[PDB]
Paper text:
During ubiquitination, the 76-amino acid protein ubiquitin (Ub) is attached via its C terminus to, most commonly, Lys residues on substrate proteins. We found that the human HECT E3 ligases UBE3C and AREL1 assemble K48/K29- and K11/K33-linked Ub chains, respectively, and can be used in combination with DUBs to generate K29- and K33-linked chains for biochemical and structural analyses.
Examination of adjacent asymmetric units only allowed one possibility for K33 chain formation, although the C termini and isopeptide linkages were poorly ordered and not built in the model. The Ub moieties in K33 chains were related by translational symmetry and, in contrast to the compact diUb structure, adopted an open conformation in which Ub moieties do not interact with each other except by two polar side chain contacts. The distinct conformations of di- and triUb could be due to differences in crystallization conditions but highlight the underlying problem that crystallization may present an incomplete picture of the dynamic states of free polyUb in solution.
Author numbering: 1 to 73
The structure:
């Protein structure tokens, strides 16, 4: 399924994911597409900071949902 990742720069990238995918794997996908190292990535959805070990389905992230990417040093 397609999801959107909104960056602070104002740019939004599209990811192809499955609800069974872990947050860690999503961050890996972001690295492959944009080159941002996972340890610098903070993902936000529905006011929650997403935890690496959990899956997208755990957070009820549906298709065409938008995640917010904030970078930590």
């Amino acid at each position: 399924m397609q999801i959107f990742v909104k960056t602070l720069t104002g740019r939004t990238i599209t990811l192809e994911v499955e609800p069974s995918d872990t947050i860690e794997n999503v961050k890996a996908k972001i690295q492959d597409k944009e080159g941002i190292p996972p340890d610098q990535q903070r993902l936000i959805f529905a006011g929650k900071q997403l935890e690496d070990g959990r899956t997208l389905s755990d957070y009820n992230i549906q298709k065409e949902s938008t995640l917010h990417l904030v970078l930590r040093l």
